Design a protein around this ligand. Sequence first.
Ligand SMILES: Nc1nc2c(c(=O)[nH]1)N[C@H]1C(S)=C(S)[C@@H](COP(=O)(O)OP(=O)(O)OC[C@H]3O[C@@H](n4cnc5c(=O)[nH]c(N)nc54)[C@H](O)[C@@H]3O)O[C@H]1N2
Ligand SMILES: Nc1nc2c(c(=O)[nH]1)N[C@H]1C(S)=C(S)[C@@H](COP(=O)(O)OP(=O)(O)OC[C@H]3O[C@@H](n4cnc5c(=O)[nH]c(N)nc54)[C@H](O)[C@@H]3O)O[C@H]1N2
Ligand code: SF4
Ligand code: SF4
Ligand code: SF4
Ligand SMILES: [Ca+2]
Ligand SMILES: [K+]
Ligand SMILES: [K+]
Ligand SMILES: [K+]
Ligand SMILES: [K+]
Ligand SMILES: [Mg+2]
Ligand code: NA
Ligand code: NA
Ligand code: NA
Ligand SMILES: [S]
Ligand SMILES: [W+6]
Ligand SMILES: [Zn+2]
Ligand SMILES: [Zn+2]
Lengths: 431, 269, 569, 130, 81
Amino acid sequence: MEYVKNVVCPFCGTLCDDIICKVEGNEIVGTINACRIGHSKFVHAEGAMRYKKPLIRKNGEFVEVSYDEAIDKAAKILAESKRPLMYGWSCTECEAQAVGVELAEEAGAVIDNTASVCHGPSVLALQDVGYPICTFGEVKNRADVVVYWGCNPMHAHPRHMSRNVFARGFFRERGRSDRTLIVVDPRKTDSAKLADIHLQLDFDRDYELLDAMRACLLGHEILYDEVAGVPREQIEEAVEVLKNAQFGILFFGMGITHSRGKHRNIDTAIMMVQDLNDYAKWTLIPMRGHYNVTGFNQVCTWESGYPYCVDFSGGEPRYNPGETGANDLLQNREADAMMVIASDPGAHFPQRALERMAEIPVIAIEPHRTPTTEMADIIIPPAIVGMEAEGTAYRMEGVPIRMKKVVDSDLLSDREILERLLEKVREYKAS
Amino acid sequence: SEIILTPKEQPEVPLEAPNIKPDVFAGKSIEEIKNIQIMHGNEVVKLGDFFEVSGEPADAPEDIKIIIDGDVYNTKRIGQEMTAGEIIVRGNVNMYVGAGMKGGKITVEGNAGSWAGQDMRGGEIEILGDAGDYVGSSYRGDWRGMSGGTITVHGNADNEIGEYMNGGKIIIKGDVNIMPGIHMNNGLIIIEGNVVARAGGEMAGGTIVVKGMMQEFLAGFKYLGVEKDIEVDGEELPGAFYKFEGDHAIKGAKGIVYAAVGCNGHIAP
Amino acid sequence: MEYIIKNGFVYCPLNGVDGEKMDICVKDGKIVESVSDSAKVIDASGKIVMPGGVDPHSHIAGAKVNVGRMYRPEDSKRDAEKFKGGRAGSGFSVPSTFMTGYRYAQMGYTTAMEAAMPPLLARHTHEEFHDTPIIDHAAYPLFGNNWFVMEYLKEGDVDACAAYASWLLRATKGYTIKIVNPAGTEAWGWGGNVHGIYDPAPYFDITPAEIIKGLAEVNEKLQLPHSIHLHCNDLGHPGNYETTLASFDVPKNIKPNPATGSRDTVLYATHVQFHSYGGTTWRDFVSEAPKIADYVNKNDHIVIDVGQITLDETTTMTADGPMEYDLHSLNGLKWANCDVELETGSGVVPFIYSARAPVPAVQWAIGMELFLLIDNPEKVCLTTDSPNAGPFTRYPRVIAWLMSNKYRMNLIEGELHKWAQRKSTVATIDREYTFSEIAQITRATSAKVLGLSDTKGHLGVGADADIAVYDINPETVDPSAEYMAIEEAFSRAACVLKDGEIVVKDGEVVASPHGRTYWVDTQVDESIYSEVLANVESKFKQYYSVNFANYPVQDDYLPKSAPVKGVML
Amino acid sequence: MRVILNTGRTIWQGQAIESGKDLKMYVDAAAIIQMNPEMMKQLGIAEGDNVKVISEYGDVVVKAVEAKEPLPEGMVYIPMGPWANRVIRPYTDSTATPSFKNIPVEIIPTDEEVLDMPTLMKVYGKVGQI
Amino acid sequence: AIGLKAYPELCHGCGNCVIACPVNALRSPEVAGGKGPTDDVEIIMIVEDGVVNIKNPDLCGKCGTCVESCPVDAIRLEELE
Ligand SMILES: Nc1nc2c(c(=O)[nH]1)N[C@H]1C(S)=C(S)[C@@H](COP(=O)(O)OP(=O)(O)OC[C@H]3O[C@@H](n4cnc5c(=O)[nH]c(N)nc54)[C@H](O)[C@@H]3O)O[C@H]1N2
Ligand SMILES: Nc1nc2c(c(=O)[nH]1)N[C@H]1C(S)=C(S)[C@@H](COP(=O)(O)OP(=O)(O)OC[C@H]3O[C@@H](n4cnc5c(=O)[nH]c(N)nc54)[C@H](O)[C@@H]3O)O[C@H]1N2
Ligand code: SF4
Ligand code: SF4
Ligand code: SF4
Ligand SMILES: [Ca+2]
Ligand SMILES: [K+]
Ligand SMILES: [K+]
Ligand SMILES: [K+]
Ligand SMILES: [K+]
Ligand SMILES: [Mg+2]
Ligand code: NA
Ligand code: NA
Ligand code: NA
Ligand SMILES: [S]
Ligand SMILES: [W+6]
Ligand SMILES: [Zn+2]
Ligand SMILES: [Zn+2]
């Protein structure tokens, strides 16, 4: 039994880098410090399918083939397509993501990540009004007001509150006792149960509440007696708590990206945070989902100039979320082929997008059996980043941390698979 | 002079045809018009591959009338950045119709996709059917949107019509969904039907008129009273209206929202 | 491989060559005495031959740059390109990485330095440099608002601060001690700032003057190739010239001691145009560039770069967090910020510098006065704090303004606001830079002050074969009258060699090799080093959000590591 | 009855996706509808009884469970997964992001069985493309 | 008597209790600052294999801080016999 310390967890955007892996004869058999989710990713569940070989769909049944045969057929599909969609990316490392961008340029494809079903509305908002953020250590060391707006970290980023709220920092040496914890959610979540203030507002009315808070912040009267189910007097009191902070942090999630208004809910929250700086030091951090969703948007931006929904059909990059996002291309029936990497749109896209996936060729670069592999024509299994392969990942507030190779696998990495696919697509485009 | 484009079967992978405009057709023969380049996904194709072409050429764009004699539901950017002349579409269009146009006129007899008249500078767009989201909007990240022109939609439209508007006029004869006039700086938006929510959200200036019912409104607005037989940029609107100034979530906001008294009693404080 | 660049008019200020017709011989990446008869000929008759350009201050790789790219899709829509044989890219003011390398190489630049790297985000800077073709490069870690620096220097422990800086330069694979608004960005961690050089940040109780002096002493104790690189307190405020002149005097009694190179100045002051303002408010504002230029002329311990306004719609991005918030408060445009735990801060705001507006017009004139009133070009570098005062693609326009008083007067008498004439002396200056002086401020001053002049910024035997050929005939061109031909020729080089291989031909990129990463390697006393490392690891356990073992940049991030030695035992 | 469908994470759905979406534990974590005990009394059901969920966009059978995180009156919660995505609003309002949260749905008790993961995906009728 | 009792089947492995505990914080500077321990240390409880695991029950003072920190009642102070 060996203990591998300082391991990076390949699950959520908290990107914990203090994991201890328990290793017995080339197998991760246990962990220390990782939460219930992180531990479940690291260890193998008895009976779960882990593909050992690539597969191709024949006539309802699948047949095992070599990497050469599977990559050859995947390359032929991408080469012959007029509007190929290359989607997912958030659960692989930055080098594999960079090969993806080069392959999307070669194929004249649209390249897009999970941001289009997640914090893509936050990206649209930050492009219009700004992005006032800080790193986790500034929250730990300075924050006296912590807000979780439309996120449930106890279920979705399980060690986030222990690392940022209960932690004793340089100027907040009493930890939890030095901070006012605020949670904004229509449900009484397990995260709201720990709050000092729970604003249990009406669903789909965050935009209306934020309009009232901003007007009040600027010295104006609130037009109505109740907004989003919160009385006028309590809105005024919440604003005073924010104005009296020495250092405030607004953490936010899917509760405002997926609900009515989408990007405009984030836009109004950002502008409130900016204007609060005339009274108190304020910043925000989007609760980025997958451990490397942030890395894709960083890589894609630095290489092309745009973060997601990037269309290379015309050679030069073009960007239009609502036209060039994965759900737009599938639901409007524009995409004629789809390559999925390190994502599960089969499980996580709406029914209208699945109807299109049933009619077009689907390539899945995936290690496990999922709803996407049930909808796939070609399955190519890789070595898993953070367990069997190394590479950079970016934390939710942009901190880059290198993922580790803890055990060995006979499978190819995502980067290796993508480099071979790029070479074969070039050969088919030429012939 | 009329130049007739009769569409062949529209492809499932959409076409992008910004070269379909009087400015490009001016000075070209019928045979040269058939060789105009358009995009079919990741391939460059000829206009003649997807349209039959006939009619009479002309040297100046102001003397050209393009008639698309059929449905072009899967053709994007028709009339993009046109300066003069006319386009009549006897059917539907996809996204970006008349995007960035400076003059002339486009008539769509059917429906239009999102971004109809995005970044418009002048001229006229008339959609006899419904329109999508972002009618007369700005582009992602830009704080400078539509600066002139008139857009009229005879049917319904969806979200964020006149997003970051900075001049011109938008008339929706039907209903809209949410956030019309979002971040509006200047211009006039008239909605003859209903609004679901958030009219004038984060507006700094300009005017929004709602003749139907606003189901929900915003607490950042100041109520100024009832005004009767109003006049806004020459448009005469008879009847009683509740008048609001805002959105006071924005610093120095001077925007005006008028809402018909008859169906907005629940919006007045 | 062998090349001979034949019959060009050579300009090499470091070797005293001022437009002489002579041949440059190249063998396997180096400039040599001679080559064999089988050497490939590059015909440079009727053309200018210069060393490859060396940019000492640009924002091209890392976190604040990528926030600028991400949050400005409209900047990309305005300028999107697909390079034949190359990669796609976009961004007028904040270009994508492949486009960045291509655009530097097209204007004959072969080395460019990343001006402001947050240590915790160092892996991001190096990953962007991997996707930046051709140019050799380095990154400057930030030290002016660092918690370890402030607590060691508070107690006068320059020996411990030197051990911390030695570890940090190696851990981040950095090259320079960069100082931005010393103490002020820490004060911005609480929503404040510092005013002048004697005002401390909260808690730390160390003044900007003490940070500047202490870091200058650390720099020379470590025998670093470049000096401290300073962005002064009070950036962009009327009357800040007094803070600037006071800052310039702080390290004047410290003797330079570089181990590598020939630097002989203790202070490098960046984008000094933004630090040369007179008056007390905008109601009595005047240029104080003549007083700043007089100080530089009379003192021997300082090199400056100008930060020239290009009169464009651009993007501001700096590690001066409170200044960026104040800029957003003035223009109301989209504002990004990033406070980095124990280390630094940053902000990004778009900015329009219109020729017809009064403050941009005076700011343009201030930079022109600094270039033209500083007598010796050995004390000046051509910069635009790219993209802050304008994008680096405008360096050829800056060259053309310096070489032509007709181009300057056409702007002054035309669109430029009358404040450029009423509030400055620019209209009374007829001086025109020569081709030798242009070569001095674009490659010789920078290479020397950076400690790289043994191999960069010159065409002598032993130099790296980084060479630019420009389609300009100095025997027939009148640079005063033909200012648009000068601008155009410096924008699209006829030929560029990087390490003795052709990378540009007639303004087009023809090869994309990876460039080297220069960084500083230092070794201090083992006893103090061990003590500082134990303290650093103890502070990581308690106050950083990452584990100490995962903090340093791994070898995987530098494909062409080029260490430069400072002090050794 | 008419209710508002909210969807998202549970720690149990997180453990199940990382253990295996082909295991029984994924059906037990994600093919469920959380509701307040008062709503279960209105419908005349108990924990473990099946519910038919119908929206304008599709239909699904899920297992009723009592909510440990209380819901506002009239709201239900299905964890993210292919069961939830049979019925939520696909439309992106020209943003690329679907409306995964707060959709009006009709819920009634049913004796029909919950479909396992491969059987549920057969509703889309995948046709082999090679 | 009253003592510390874990219910690992209800536990999220969030670590709130581990960090909040004053005994753990005093013994481990990493824990005091919100991290899980990396240096070898003897503390009351740790998150192991994804759930809370009691290691040194004799060090517990039965203060109730961990109990307030857990929203799912997975760590309690109750009669052990
Ligand atoms: N267990 C688990 N954890 C995960 C994942 C997973 O699949 N499983 N995936 C990861 C990913 S990719 C992401 S993006 C994160 C997301 O993590 P979160 O952002 O926490 O996402 P959700 O749990 O989907 O929704 C958060 C909350 O929004 C609330 N909500 C619903 N409607 C509204 C509204 O109108 N207003 C407000 N204020 N709140 C509302 C819900 O009640 C819910 O508690 O989780 C990550 N972590
Ligand atoms: N109804 C509803 N639907 C939702 C949501 C909601 O709140 N409600 N949330 C949405 C959001 S925010 C998101 S991000 C999506 C969830 O986003 P998805 O990307 O669909 O989430 P996962 O199911 O975690 O899929 C990750 C996949 O990557 C695989 N994988 C892991 N490691 C590696 C690797 O190293 N290489 C490769 N190639 N593969 C790897 C895993 O086996 C897994 O199948 O769901 C969306 N859908
Ligand atoms: S909080 Fe997220 S990153 Fe940290 S251990 Fe749990 S799943 Fe892994
Ligand atoms: S017992 Fe409670 S507080 Fe402690 S790790 Fe488990 S869920 Fe978190
Ligand atoms: S009761 Fe007090 S001493 Fe015992 S484990 Fe909980 S917090 Fe620590
Ligand atoms: Ca916009
Ligand atoms: K697993
Ligand atoms: K950009
Ligand atoms: K000197
Ligand atoms: K409890
Ligand atoms: Mg800081
Ligand atoms: Na600094
Ligand atoms: Na003038
Ligand atoms: Na209920
Ligand atoms: S995500
Ligand atoms: W997500
Ligand atoms: Zn600077
Ligand atoms: Zn700078």
